[PDB]
Symmetry: C2
Subunit: 98 residues, 2 copies
Amino acid sequence: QPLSPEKHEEAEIAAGFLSAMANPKRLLILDSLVKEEMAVGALANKVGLSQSALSQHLSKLRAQNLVSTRRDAQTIYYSSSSDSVMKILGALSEIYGA
Amino acid sequence: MQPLSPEKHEEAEIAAGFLSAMANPKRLLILDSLVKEEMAVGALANKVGLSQSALSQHLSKLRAQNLVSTRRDAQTIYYSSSSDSVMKILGALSEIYG
């Protein structure tokens, strides 16, 4: 007996989310954004990558609804209050140590 | 301030490698099924709705991250997963998505 189409569709959603997290740079970004607010520059900095790129990851992270934004003048501050991201980071924390 | 240490980058690389092994819908269905049930390659391919080519591919990627165990009885290889990591991530996903 094959798996229902529902579990097939759920596997697609879950894998979409995990795909958003299954990148080292994105992992570092989400770590940083979970523990503090950052303007895009400082963030590109802490994770040690360039901003064409940092925009790269922020876009894929926004696609999975994993980050929040706030705007002061024309400066955007990113953060993450995602329960999903926090649960996965918790899991990884337990797997690899905190 | 201080960009992230090289060690946190290497930890992110490992963690992301693991998540990458899991960040595929087919691999999620496979690991869900294999936790913690022995299945032969044929039955697994039928359960996950795959041909032996894709299943071979997926299983190879799962073995690369040490996520599955095998046992051989004569002419049959039986697959399972007793991975603590896989179980923690599946637990998280269960709680995230119901």
